[model samples]
Target: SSTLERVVYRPDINQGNYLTANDVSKIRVGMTQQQVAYALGTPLMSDPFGTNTWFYVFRQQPGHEGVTQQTLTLTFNSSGVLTNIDNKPALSGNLEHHHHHH
Candidate 1:
């Protein structure tokens, strides 16, 4: 005997900023907040406490399963000059380069 199974199709979901290496390369330590935003686009989150911290998050939802997220944090001084840049790459690609479903 055999059992039948059906699965619902879910389209890929992409949330947050999507920055490439070249885009990030444009950011420099002394750049102003406006300049940074021009290069990398507006951040996903900004510090409400006026800490001068901005966060960029990239999230990808695969239809079948799995989550992929990449994050970048930018710290600025009171003067709005970029001070620190932190990039946290995705933990795994999970066959990201290939997509085939039939």
Candidate 2:
């Protein structure tokens, strides 16, 4: 019966990063795979076939704020050029996109 309270042991997790507002901004369309990697680090998974496409499923697994959670998908053409960047703001932070190089 009524005994222990409610609590979920949040593992050492909740500390990863698929992408940040600041980092993701640096990423742009038509960026080479290498360039993108340099900007936001290597993706979690890429096309195993080594064809065309890089998948970045950012579902709180990376930086688990426990607020924002979703998957980020990036696609590349046969030439290895980022053609599509699809995914919502995996960050639950404010929706104010800004950029400043310093």
Model 1 lDDT per residue over 4-35, tens place? 78888767543344655556678889888888
State the C-alpha lDDT per candidate: 0.65, 0.61
Off by over 4 Å in 2: 1-18, 43-51, 57-68, 89-102
Q: Which candidate is the best by TM-score?
A: 1
Per-residue alpha-carbon lDDT of model 2 for 1-102, expressed as tens digits?
889889988774534644454556688889888888888787544566865655565433334343445556677775668898776664433221233324
Model 2 residue pairs with clashes: 16-63
TM agreement with the true structure for every prediction: 0.49, 0.48
15 Cα displacement, candidate 1 (Å): 14
TM-score, candidate number 2: 0.48
What is the Å distance of residue 7 in model 2 from its true position?
36
